[PDB]
Each structure stands twice: as C-alpha cells, then as structure tokens.
Design a protein around this ligand. Structure first.
Ligand SMILES: C[C@]12CC[C@H]3[C@@H](CCC4=CC(=O)CC[C@@]43C)[C@@H]1CC[C@@H]2C(=O)CO
Length: 239
C-alpha cells in the first residue's frame, strides 16, 4: 500500500533564493546551494515523519537515519527533478536555480556536478517511474546506519527488508530490480565524494567565504566530526 501514501507525502516545491545579477563565482554558488539544502531538509523531515514503518521507530532512530543519509536524499532528489523537468538535460536544484555546463563549470564543483548528472542520466535510460523512485528513496533513508547498529535495530531490518520486498513488488523483472538496486549502491560512491567536499568547505568556512545556514551546521558538525573515518556503515545490495 505505501506507494500510494508516498505520492501524497512526496515533498513539493522549494526555492533556493539567489539574488542573481553580478558575477557568481564559487563563493556564490555554494552559499546559495547550501542555503538551498537547509530548506529542503525541513521538507525531508516533514516527509520522513509520515513514512510507513519509519514513523514507528522512536524519534531517536528516525533523526539518526536522516542525519547519516541526508546527502543521499537531497542528491538522489536532485536527479529526479533534473530528470522530470529537463529530461536530465540539466541539474534542476531549484525552480530558481538551474545548472548548465557553465554553472557546473564556475561553481568550483564541476566533477561532482557531473557525477550527480550521471545519475539523472541513468534515470532517463532506465526511464524510472515515480513508483520506483519513491521506494528507492526510502531505501536511501534506510541505507546508512551507525557502524554499531540501532536501538530498534531488529525492528529496523524487518522494515527495510519489507521495503526491499516492496521495490521488487514494484519491479513486477529481476534485471530491473538489479539495475535499480545497483543504482542506489553506486549512490554510496557519489555521496562519500560529495561529503568530503562539503566537509572541507565547512572546516574552511570563513577563509573560503562559503557560508552554511544553521540547520546544516548542527548536522555536519554531527555527521563528519568523527565519522570522516568509517563509523558510517552503508548497507549495499550486491557484490
Ligand atoms: C553540500 C553542497 C551544497 C548543497 C547541495 C550538495 C549536492 C546535492 C544537493 C542537491 C540538491 O538538489 C539541493 C542542494 C544540495 C544539498 C553539495 C555538494 C557539495 C556542496 C558544498 O560542499 C558547499 O560548500
């Protein structure tokens, strides 16, 4: 049943809010992009809190998972918007913020922009259906746990596996499932890339003149303060 509920809960529109006009170099794209991230998060939490099964684990587990997987979320989402609106032609961050080989170019991010684009590209080729995306997206929320587990760990695995079963239910064949689960797996590869960059732009804020809101502040100072190592255990799907 969930799928139905997911269409409903599937977050809406979010504006980045960039007073575009004068030269927009690194110090410009990133502070607005971060700002953008800060607003979508308020949206992701609103989304997750009604999710089937997930809304059932105590508030502690819920927030942890959102933290260890926030980057996957937003990035996976960027791909879908880029794919739904521009046919993947571009990276649709926000209605008021679209990227062309020029924005990616002078965003000081061209390389990661290309990676997130390579994802949207896989969406087109596979011609992803909302159903698939919505379920895959829950799988990303449920894809990176604390190396040592969760309080409601047992309840957690049954849940995720159920969503697995659901995605395969949706896939109804085994090749499709496979392509989709392999896509999500690869995501773990991109996200680690996006995170190390986000982290060093964090640690080197003022000096690079790249600001972060406050919402994203309390999250990164929490996410990478010690996990820049390997206490963040992603849960792949294949080998
Ligand atoms: C965190 C980040 C700015 C904000 C974006 C993130 C990439 C994924 C993403 C996709 C979206 O659809 C909205 C903003 C955002 C969440 C970037 C990767 C590096 C960059 C920085 O490191 C900024 O200094």
């Amino acid at each position: 049943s969930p799928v139905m509920v997911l269409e409903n809960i599937e977050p809406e529109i979010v504006y980045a809010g960039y007073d575009s006009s004068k030269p927009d170099t690194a110090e410009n794209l990133l502070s607005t992009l971060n700002r953008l991230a800060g607003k979508q998060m308020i949206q992701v939490v609103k989304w997750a809190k009604v999710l089937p099964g997930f809304k059932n684990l105590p508030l502690e587990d819920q927030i942890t998972l959102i933290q260890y997987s926030w980057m996957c979320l937003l990035s996976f989402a960027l791909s879908w918007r880029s794919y739904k609106h521009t046919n993947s032609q571009f990276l649709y961050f926000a209605p008021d913020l679209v990227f062309n080989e020029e924005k990616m170019h002078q965003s000081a991010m061209y390389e990661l922009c290309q990676g997130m684009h390579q994802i949207s590209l896989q969406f087109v080729r596979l011609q992803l259906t909302f159903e698939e995306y919505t379920i895959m997206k829950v799988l990303l929320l449920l894809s990176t746990i604390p190396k040592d587990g969760l309080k409601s760990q047992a309840a957690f695995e049954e849940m995720r596996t159920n969503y697995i079963k659901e995605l395969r239910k949706m896939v109804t064949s085994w090749q499709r499932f496979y392509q989709l689960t392999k896509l999500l797996d690869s995501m773990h590869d991109l996200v680690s890339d996006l995170l190390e960059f986000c982290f060093y732009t964090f640690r080197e804020s003022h000096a690079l003149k790249v600001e972060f809101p406050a919402m994203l502040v309390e999250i990164i100072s929490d996410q990478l303060p010690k996990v820049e190592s390997g206490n963040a255990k992603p849960l792949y799907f294949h080998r």
